[PDB]
Design an enzyme around this catalytic site. Sequence first.
Site, PDB file in Angstrom:
ATOM      1  N   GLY A 209       8.503  49.072  28.829  1.00 44.84           N
ATOM      2  CA  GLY A 209       7.216  49.719  29.008  1.00 44.84           C
ATOM      3  C   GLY A 209       6.343  49.065  30.087  1.00 44.84           C
ATOM      4  O   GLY A 209       5.148  49.018  29.973  1.00 44.84           O
ATOM      5  N   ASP A 232      11.302  51.800  31.380  1.00 44.53           N
ATOM      6  CA  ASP A 232      10.313  52.681  30.796  1.00 44.53           C
ATOM      7  C   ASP A 232      10.875  54.092  30.975  1.00 44.53           C
ATOM      8  O   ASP A 232      11.919  54.284  31.606  1.00 44.53           O
ATOM      9  CB  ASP A 232       8.942  52.517  31.487  1.00 44.53           C
ATOM     10  N   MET A 253      13.986  53.721  24.883  1.00 45.69           N
ATOM     11  CA  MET A 253      14.356  52.402  24.362  1.00 45.69           C
ATOM     12  C   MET A 253      14.996  52.518  22.970  1.00 45.69           C
ATOM     13  O   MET A 253      15.580  51.541  22.440  1.00 45.69           O
ATOM     14  CB  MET A 253      13.172  51.431  24.296  1.00 45.69           C
ATOM     15  N   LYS A 266       6.030  43.482  24.941  1.00 49.75           N
ATOM     16  CA  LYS A 266       4.611  43.261  24.802  1.00 49.75           C
ATOM     17  C   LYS A 266       3.965  44.516  24.204  1.00 49.75           C
ATOM     18  O   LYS A 266       3.901  45.580  24.859  1.00 49.75           O
ATOM     19  CB  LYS A 266       4.009  42.927  26.167  1.00 49.75           C
ATOM     20  N   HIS A 270       4.445  46.785  17.636  1.00 46.42           N
ATOM     21  CA  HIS A 270       3.409  46.949  16.654  1.00 46.42           C
ATOM     22  C   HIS A 270       3.021  48.439  16.560  1.00 46.42           C
ATOM     23  O   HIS A 270       2.289  48.793  15.678  1.00 46.42           O
ATOM     24  CB  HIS A 270       2.283  45.968  16.989  1.00 46.42           C
ATOM     25  N   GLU A 298       2.965  39.637  20.639  1.00 45.23           N
ATOM     26  CA  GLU A 298       2.278  40.299  19.577  1.00 45.23           C
ATOM     27  C   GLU A 298       1.371  39.277  18.922  1.00 45.23           C
ATOM     28  O   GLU A 298       1.621  38.032  18.976  1.00 45.23           O
ATOM     29  CB  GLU A 298       3.237  40.820  18.498  1.00 45.23           C
TER      30      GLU A 298
END
Lengths: 365, 363
Positions: A209, A232, A253, A266, A270, A298
Amino acid sequence: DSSARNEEDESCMFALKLLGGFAVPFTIKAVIELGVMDQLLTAERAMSAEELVAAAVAAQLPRPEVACTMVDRLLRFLASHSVVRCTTEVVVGTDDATTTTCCRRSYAASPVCKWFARNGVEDSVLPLGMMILNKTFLDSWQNITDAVLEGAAPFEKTYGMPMFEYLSTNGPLNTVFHEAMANHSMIITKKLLKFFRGFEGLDVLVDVGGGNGTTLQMIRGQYKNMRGINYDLPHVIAQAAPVEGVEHVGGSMFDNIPRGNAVLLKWILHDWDDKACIKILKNCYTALHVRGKVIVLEYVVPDEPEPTLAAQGAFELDLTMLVTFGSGKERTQREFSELAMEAGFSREFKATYIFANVWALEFTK
Amino acid sequence: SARNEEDESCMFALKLLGGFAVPFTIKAVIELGVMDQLLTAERAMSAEELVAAAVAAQLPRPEVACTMVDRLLRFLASHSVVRCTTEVVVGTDDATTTTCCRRSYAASPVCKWFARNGVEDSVLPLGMMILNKTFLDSWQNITDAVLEGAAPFEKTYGMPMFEYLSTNGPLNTVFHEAMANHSMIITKKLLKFFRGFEGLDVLVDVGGGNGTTLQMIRGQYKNMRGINYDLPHVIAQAAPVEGVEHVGGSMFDNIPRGNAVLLKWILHDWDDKACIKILKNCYTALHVRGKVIVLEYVVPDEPEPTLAAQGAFELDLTMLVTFGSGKERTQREFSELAMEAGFSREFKATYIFANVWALEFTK
Ligand SMILES: Oc1ccc(/C=C/c2cc(O)cc(O)c2)cc1
Ligand SMILES: Oc1ccc(/C=C/c2cc(O)cc(O)c2)cc1
């Protein structure tokens, strides 16, 4: 009615404090959008509301004395919370552009206010702030109730679709989002370069990403003999410039991840539930060679809801993920390790604190 | 060290920018029924327990609802709003968000102030107005409002609040319920701690609604008559009350005669000039040795970083958003209003509760 009376009074007020804790944020936004905060930051003496409006606002004002008294009152409130310093001087006449006849207040930035600088990311979290406080995300948060019942993400309940999807239909919000993430990315990546020793001696590095501020450019910047791969989605990769020492690759992904000696995630994990995370991490396992590493940037919630500023910030991030994504969530050390082990990684774990609640967490094959 | 200082400072900035999170998480916890359940529960209770008890509605994804509620309460606990105890699970619990670990939650003392079924000691109705989205949307329009020197409410809805309330029955109800709420609490504490109703033959309440307030007071001073003054629209809908004449009219025109006048949360709605109109009308209304009794917050002369000061400047801003020229006032500023309106250089201040004072001016 001595002491019983005060306990009750304190408690009542504390109730009210909790119910109104939005005031500070919304007042900060408005002081920033007027340019009054930037003027505080460029100032070498204390400055009154009148002075600060004249400096921040070039335009002829239709009711200038009222705009001044309003700004005075906003800054008086911030001052009571220690966001600005406030000094008081005597009249010598009658000045109409402060909210008190006797007494003009003059304001100066607190240390903290530097993080609201507009000019550039010279150590500012403002673009991130602009996202945290955007109408669209704030509307979601007022609609958690109905989202919980449906077991749905408040975002989606409120806009009838996943945030990511929404972003492609609304360029203005898309801009905000990418600016926020580039913002955070820049601060974090700069700090990484100072504190983190996990990039040394790695021949290829895959960024998942990224692309466009790349982040790999900054890193590769300080590890000249490191090559980078920018993974990405194709829509995003179709807009990437050729960059020195960086292959750009397009794809999902969840389907696959490119081979390197290390992979970087990164603020990816989450956003997703454990099941989705494990798909992702498995794809990293199959990408990586043995001795290689996933590097996870994270926050790490503590095992328990400790009343510390650090803890509170992490649980707050958790709730942002809740509002935004539903099943997106923040994780403990333990919880991350467990994800790594499901996805095949060994019982060898590294954690290094970076900055502003973010850790680098490393799993090896 | 300047790495650590910088760390702390950055996190501080983010704290400041996101402090709405607490309020909105509390709101949700209240609308789910979960806060009431905490408040009645005998021991600590998990999210699963609390959702089963609070939510009658058929749940399409019950395990997700539970983990969501867990996460809410985990956050509140980090802020000392709920107490949180954590146990090892001996089996598979997926109705709390940690595999290893079930949490159980209990009310903190503060929570009693969020009680539903409104009883004695709850500010929830007032809370529901503080956090109403119609009101909160105005705070997103402060910038542009300040420029025009306008009230953000009017910037947002194109008219003053009170006029706006005539258009929206639901928000009218919210507003009235909130004011009645706070008035009830404040009146109860007044009757405990304030002595300035002693010996009053007539009391005039200005903008006190259905006369609830005069009823409560008269209840402790039986020989005291009240006069309930408000707009005719408000009065023509107010129930008879023993020993209270209801009068309809504008406080800007005039005010019924009596020994004292009560102004609860009236003055702070208005600028200096309007306040002086109102107080002058009170001056003429009162027979001699008469008093105005003002029930308002009193901002300190300086922005002191105290919990009390903060709450008064927070109220100030609410006035600013709601009315623009509506505002909170220092003792000195109140005194100057009274002196403009004819009252003597004589001033009495009695603390009541929750940052509200009874200020008395004498004719
Ligand atoms: O802590 C608190 C936060 C907000 C409030 C609101 C009060 C209020 C009073 C009015 O007369 C009109 C209004 O529109 C709002 C009170 C306490
Ligand atoms: O104080 C705060 C600190 C950080 C954040 C981060 C928010 C964020 C929001 C998303 O929608 C996606 C994301 O990957 C990150 C918000 C508040």
